[PDB]
Enzyme design. Structure first.
Site, short mmCIF file in Angstrom:
data_model
loop_
_atom_site.label_atom_id
_atom_site.label_comp_id
_atom_site.label_asym_id
_atom_site.label_seq_id
_atom_site.Cartn_x
_atom_site.Cartn_y
_atom_site.Cartn_z
N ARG A 74 38.01 -35.73 6.09
CA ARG A 74 38.97 -36.91 5.94
C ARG A 74 38.75 -37.67 4.91
O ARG A 74 38.07 -38.99 5.09
CB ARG A 74 39.22 -37.51 7.46
CG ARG A 74 40.59 -36.54 7.96
CD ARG A 74 40.68 -37.02 9.46
NE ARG A 74 41.43 -35.86 10.25
CZ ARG A 74 41.49 -35.96 11.60
NH1 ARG A 74 41.28 -36.99 12.42
NH2 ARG A 74 42.13 -34.81 12.04
N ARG A 95 34.28 -44.69 -1.65
CA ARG A 95 34.73 -43.45 -2.15
C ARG A 95 33.62 -42.79 -2.90
O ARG A 95 33.55 -41.54 -3.13
CB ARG A 95 35.87 -43.82 -3.15
CG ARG A 95 37.12 -44.42 -2.55
CD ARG A 95 37.72 -43.54 -1.56
NE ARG A 95 38.33 -42.38 -2.40
CZ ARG A 95 39.20 -41.39 -1.66
NH1 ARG A 95 39.43 -41.49 -0.41
NH2 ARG A 95 39.72 -40.25 -2.56
N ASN A 137 39.61 -34.98 -1.33
CA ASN A 137 39.73 -35.98 -2.02
C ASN A 137 38.09 -36.43 -2.41
O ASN A 137 37.37 -36.19 -1.52
CB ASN A 137 40.19 -37.26 -1.33
CG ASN A 137 41.80 -37.30 -1.66
OD1 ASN A 137 42.36 -36.87 -2.73
ND2 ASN A 137 42.53 -37.50 -0.62
N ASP A 143 52.24 -37.93 -4.09
CA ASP A 143 52.70 -39.60 -4.32
C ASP A 143 54.09 -39.35 -5.06
O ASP A 143 54.85 -40.09 -4.47
CB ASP A 143 51.59 -39.75 -5.47
CG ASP A 143 50.29 -39.63 -5.31
OD1 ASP A 143 49.55 -40.65 -5.39
OD2 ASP A 143 49.78 -38.44 -4.91
N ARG A 156 56.53 -38.44 -2.08
CA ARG A 156 56.71 -39.89 -1.28
C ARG A 156 57.39 -40.78 -1.95
O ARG A 156 58.22 -41.36 -1.33
CB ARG A 156 55.29 -40.53 -1.05
CG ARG A 156 54.57 -39.71 0.12
CD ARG A 156 53.52 -40.72 0.42
NE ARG A 156 52.74 -40.37 1.64
CZ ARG A 156 51.84 -39.59 1.75
NH1 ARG A 156 50.88 -39.40 0.51
NH2 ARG A 156 50.97 -39.27 3.07
N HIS A 211 45.00 -40.31 -8.60
CA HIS A 211 45.75 -40.08 -7.23
C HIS A 211 45.31 -40.97 -6.43
O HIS A 211 44.11 -41.77 -6.35
CB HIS A 211 45.32 -38.73 -6.42
CG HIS A 211 45.65 -38.47 -5.02
ND1 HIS A 211 47.12 -38.58 -4.78
CD2 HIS A 211 45.00 -38.56 -4.09
CE1 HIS A 211 46.93 -38.35 -3.26
NE2 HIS A 211 45.96 -38.32 -2.78
N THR A 246 46.60 -37.27 8.11
CA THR A 246 47.92 -36.75 7.55
C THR A 246 47.81 -35.01 7.33
O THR A 246 46.72 -34.58 7.10
CB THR A 246 48.26 -37.15 5.89
OG1 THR A 246 49.25 -36.64 5.08
CG2 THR A 246 46.90 -37.09 4.90
#
Ligand SMILES: NC(=O)c1ccc[n+]([C@@H]2O[C@H](COP(=O)([O-])OP(=O)(O)OC[C@H]3O[C@@H](n4cnc5c(N)ncnc54)[C@H](O)[C@@H]3O)[C@@H](O)[C@H]2O)c1
Ligand SMILES: NC(=O)c1ccc[n+]([C@@H]2O[C@H](COP(=O)([O-])OP(=O)(O)OC[C@H]3O[C@@H](n4cnc5c(N)ncnc54)[C@H](O)[C@@H]3O)[C@@H](O)[C@H]2O)c1
Ligand SMILES: NC(=O)c1ccc[n+]([C@@H]2O[C@H](COP(=O)([O-])OP(=O)(O)OC[C@H]3O[C@@H](n4cnc5c(N)ncnc54)[C@H](O)[C@@H]3O)[C@@H](O)[C@H]2O)c1
Ligand SMILES: NC(=O)c1ccc[n+]([C@@H]2O[C@H](COP(=O)([O-])OP(=O)(O)OC[C@H]3O[C@@H](n4cnc5c(N)ncnc54)[C@H](O)[C@@H]3O)[C@@H](O)[C@H]2O)c1
Ligand SMILES: O=C1C[C@](c2ccsc2)(c2cccc(Nc3ccc(F)cc3)n2)NC(=O)[C@H]1Sc1ccccc1Cl
Ligand SMILES: O=C1C[C@](c2ccsc2)(c2cccc(Nc3ccc(F)cc3)n2)NC(=O)[C@H]1Sc1ccccc1Cl
Lengths: 328, 331, 323, 325
Positions: free
Chosen positions: A98, A102, A134, A162, A165, A189, A244
């Site tokens: 998840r 970063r 990610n 993105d 959405r 992103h 998500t």
């Protein structure tokens, strides 16, 4: 003279390689949502699942197999060893996990990719890689480096979600179906995404032409809040359910449809932008690309404002800053 | 006026009543699997979600809404209040926590009966003409509970029942024969779960009776041990729980299949839990799975299956057992 | 630089080949129905159309192409030359007379070699009538292994039977099981033994099922299957929609390698005392290699004799044919 | 006891009014293409077919019925009497015959159809396909007495679909990703909207200002000329057009039957827009839902594009004023 022998006469034992096989690496919440969406869109003749948690991997495989009567995917396989992934047309990487930053996650996921990508290339050297894990922009480069595959066969999920959405939020505001609410979110992103206001339209009617202050701090209606909601909503969903799955799974399966069926549809996916917007580093950002049976065959050159190009350039510099320090 | 008013001219802002609405009560692993399978099958023009956990509810609704572009359901709503369920054609009950390895069947009954005491009346209030599809376990016991509380006729109270059991059976049957489960016919009836009845006489591939070819089919005297196919249906169910903690995709896909027959008024036959009083010597109000014809009125008719003395006894035993639990339930 | 070069930056242009190509031969009522059905089912990434009448062929291609926005088939090609059918996974032959054998054999004398030429690893699907004889004609000329040479056979006959069965029982044809085997048309064989709903045998519940003794006249359901074919032809002029849908159903099983059982015309030599090279409908497992397997149906002495009769009749015509 | 009774035990002998019923009037090449597409898209639970030629009508009904196993529409009906069309959500008119003369000919046909449609389905949405679509949508609207939202014409939905296919063929992109709007009068007098032509939101007119002008080096005006030239070409090559229109009608049917609120270039009452003050039906982008046309997109048009819509409206009204109902 078994029951099968009494009932069925065999014409041939000629076992053949799967024609339209897909592999999903990572049977987490994201990967399983990709797996179900693909299965229900009838895109694969064989579906292979890979993960390091042997039990969770067997259970998910069996749960999908028990629905075979309601599906048109005759073979569902899984395993820790990548021999199960042999002759895959498309390989979807969702593997990872998840308070943390970063940068901490980058080398952490690089070590994971250092095993997956070679094993994927071993059993499926002519596949298209669709990176979801990610930071997708960074990890698409990471995968492209380790694979040695040409740019076209290395695709990153990027800003497909993105934009989806964005189109949904644009749709709610206007009371029109997202399919008819056109708008593009590009570049990095996540938080550093770029809402391309110039292309935001309904039925060929530029919303920037009618509302000249669209997506600016001046704007009476404050349409810039729609893009602010694109970043906020994602954080909100994690705050409400912890993860998500459904939205990303659906977006991935749409990309899968373009690739598997060679549709030549335009999608905002992560590709190498080197040579565009004054970028000269080997970095991957989302631009609208033409998706076919060989991945990114072409990319659309979007005319951006000086402010928009600078936003992409900043993202490109920051991503390379992390990349130049990476161990391969 | 505004950008919306300058871009779009309005002809009318009236009525707005749902024509093909579906409700999913309980946004857990099973509930959400039903939802995604239903959305990807274009069965509803409106999907509603209900749950006690407000956070998970709002979160799950948003995750579905963010995928809208790749779907044909123009409205996804969610709320703790049942006002959001109004005018549903079909209401799916997947509410109540899954069975804990610790807790028993009777413990799962009492707990889910208390839950239904507030779900069903609230569902009825806003959707008095809907079809109730019960998924929550023990599905057979709770389809009866739902029927009694609602005051709905037999036809509009449907339980998931043996639709999954038969789906697992046809997959296993197909795996052994190297044929697609669609072409492998086999019916698993009665009590859903461990006590389910495999109907060996109806087992066929292209009309060819497997029992006629292989008389030892189903018996313990079988060298090929085909009786293990039904044992594996029960074993696989437990195995998936041991391996991933629950089952979602398989049940979600079978429930969507049921929803398809109802919503489209197909009149296809399905092994679903229905009121079995009058059949196989059963005299009490017990809900067991038999092949049912599903359309716009739920269960319009049922298929009379010729059971063997043994198969009949297993149905009677389940009926006697389920009535024993049901006769001691407070309403 | 053009508007295309200004808008789109190319990474690679080398014209990639189709992975799921389907060819339809004969753009008549049947062929076009197959085409639309196959297109609306998302089975092909490329559709090829062949016909001797160039004008109708160009128009049919154009009309399909104008609806590309509503379809998921990125390429639709047509032409008199079979080069447009290069590397097809499945080839469907619908070209022919709506005597009926003689002309169609002379048509297949040119079609079949031209198909094999550009698509050697393809699966042939014969629709053109008499479907059972023409599957042998196609198999004979191609030199393809019997698994890759398939005839429409009784897939439509079984579709019609299940519709009539369904109308009679008030159940969807999907849930009404019944098999019509052997010759397509008049000489077809209803397998009453296997006729059921939910595993329950109709012959067990109604012993008179199929006999003249039958008060409910269920023997008429099979007669109606034969009647309907002629009836639609009389009222409409031809049959198109039903065959198109059945052909697309077979196409789905072949293209997606489903391994579903279908009543399709195959080499039945070796079974039911048949020794001649005849193609009759029996339940077949269809996949990516065509007919991979065959279902051995337990038939009565009457049924078995009807297939041998069909075999003798068809071979009687087949041996007199000049290749 | 009958076999049916022995096998099946009845709980309730029904019968409910059709929930998602579609009617197709005219079982010609257009109407039968609309029928197969609607069936293969799972839009209806009941399909009703109506025509004057009884033989063709029963033959077409039977052919579709024989493929019911491969469909998800459990009831297909047909008849000369409009009782078979009762309680329909959407009624599609394809009645006529390929091709002032053809107008009054089809007006006389409609003079019988429309009242019969209103009698059994007074709450239905009307979709006109019959040519001249823009004139016959007006005819149907006046005869029906339905509000303008329940009276829709296929209009430029096909003209836009053709434009998008040709656009996509030029650029080597899928028509789904090639956006272009053809508005106004369906056919010869169709108006291409160059300002709206785009791929990925990138305006083709902004990059290439010569787009849609005489001085165009790549001659993009020929794309729109090919849209109308394609129609005549197909008519000349195979005698009629069927597949393309059937798919586009199924697309409209999907938006209506599923209340998608998608935007389509369909023929609608344009009185009050672009200087048009007459009761004429012209194609503009419309929101299609359960109530038909709920809203419409107000496209910014150049004075040349605006004048073309006015010229269409003037020619159409010239014909519309000389009609007897
Ligand atoms: N690009 C996008 O738009 C987008 C959107 C949403 C989520 N994501 C990403 O998807 C990723 C996963 O999300 P999640 O909810 O599924 O996480 P998860 O924790 O639920 O599942 C992750 C899975 O990865 C597996 N995994 C870890 N190391 C592995 C290895 N070496 N080999 C095989 N499998 C391994 C784990 O076992 C685990 O099952 C995250 O990185 C997340 O950021 C991307
Ligand atoms: N019929 C079948 O074949 C079959 C198959 C698998 C599972 N099931 C059953 O489905 C049920 C749920 O499965 P699960 O894995 O999703 O459990 P779960 O714990 O993951 O989800 C249950 C949901 O019910 C909600 N809930 C609890 N009380 C509620 C109430 N009063 N009102 C509304 N919602 C409420 C919970 O918040 C939770 O979201 C179980 O009873 C399970 O046994 C049936
Ligand atoms: N197997 C079945 O169940 C079934 C059902 C219905 C019809 N059919 C058969 O299908 C055939 C055709 O049906 P139809 O209604 O479309 O007839 P049709 O006359 O409308 O179409 C025949 C087409 O084949 C073309 N053609 C003729 N010779 C050709 C050649 N050498 N190469 C390429 N194309 C050629 C014709 O130009 C014509 O377009 C008939 O033989 C008919 O009996 C089979
Ligand atoms: N709007 C578009 O984009 C578009 C495109 C192509 C064709 N069309 C139009 O569609 C119409 C029909 O096309 P076609 O090729 O199917 O014609 P067709 O000749 O094949 O058949 C038309 C049918 O209308 C029937 N009909 C005539 N009067 C009738 C009545 N009073 N009641 C019921 N049915 C009646 C005929 O019997 C006939 O079956 C034409 O007017 C044509 O111009 C529109
Ligand atoms: O990229 C992700 C992963 C994430 C996410 C990442 C940043 S905010 C949400 C996701 C999924 C699972 C776990 C986490 N954990 C996480 C959350 C916040 C944080 F700061 C760091 C990690 N994040 N959820 C998402 O829906 C997607 S799309 C997205 C994210 C941000 C802005 C705009 C968009 Cl379209
Ligand atoms: O009915 C259920 C719920 C259950 C289950 C119930 C009994 S064994 C598996 C399920 C879902 C979630 C949690 C649990 N846990 C649980 C199971 C048994 C027990 F004794 C205690 C807890 N079980 N999983 C399932 O797949 C279905 S279908 C099934 C179950 C048994 C035999 C055959 C079949 Cl087709």
């Amino acid at each position: 003279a078994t029951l099968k022998d009494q009932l069925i006469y065999n014409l041939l034992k000629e076992e053949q390689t799967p024609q339209n096989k897909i592999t999903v690496v990572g049977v987490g919440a994201v990967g399983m949502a990709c797996a179900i969406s693909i299965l229900m869109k009838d895109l694969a003749d064989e579906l292979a699942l890979v993960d390091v948690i042997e039990d969770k991997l067997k259970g998910e495989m069996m749960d999908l197999q028990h629905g075979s009567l309601f599906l048109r995917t005759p073979k569902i396989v899984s395993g820790k060893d990548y021999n199960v992934t042999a002759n895959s047309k498309l390989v979807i990487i969702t593997a990872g996990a998840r308070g943390e930053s970063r940068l901490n996650l980058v080398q952490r996921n690089v070590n994971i990719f250092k095993f997956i990508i070679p094993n994927v290339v071993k059993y499926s050297p002519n596949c298209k890689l669709l990176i979801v894990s990610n930071p997708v922009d960074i990890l698409t480069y990471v995968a492209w480096k380790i694979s040695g595959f040409p740019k076209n066969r290395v695709i990153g999920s990027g800003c497909n979600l993105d934009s989806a959405r964005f189109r949904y939020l644009m749709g709610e505001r206007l009371g029109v179906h997202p399919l008819s609410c056109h708008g593009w979110v590009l570049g990095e992103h996540g938080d550093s995404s770029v809402p391309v206001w110039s292309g935001m339209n309904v039925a060929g009617v530029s919303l920037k032409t009618l509302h000249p202050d669209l997506g600016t701090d001046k704007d009476k209606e404050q349409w810039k809040e729609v893009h602010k909601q694109v970043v906020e909503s994602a954080y909100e969903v994690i705050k409400l359910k912890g993860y998500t799955s459904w939205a990303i799974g659906l977006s991935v399966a749409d990309l899968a449809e373009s690739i598997m069926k060679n549709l030549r549809r335009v999608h905002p996916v992560s590709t190498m932008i080197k040579g565009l917007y004054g970028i000269k580093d080997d970095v991957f950002l989302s631009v609208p690309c033409i998706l076919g049976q060989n991945g990114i065959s072409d990319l659309v050159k979007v005319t951006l404002t000086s402010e928009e190009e600078a936003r992409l350039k900043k993202s490109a510099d920051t991503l390379w800053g992390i990349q130049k320090e990476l161990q391969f």
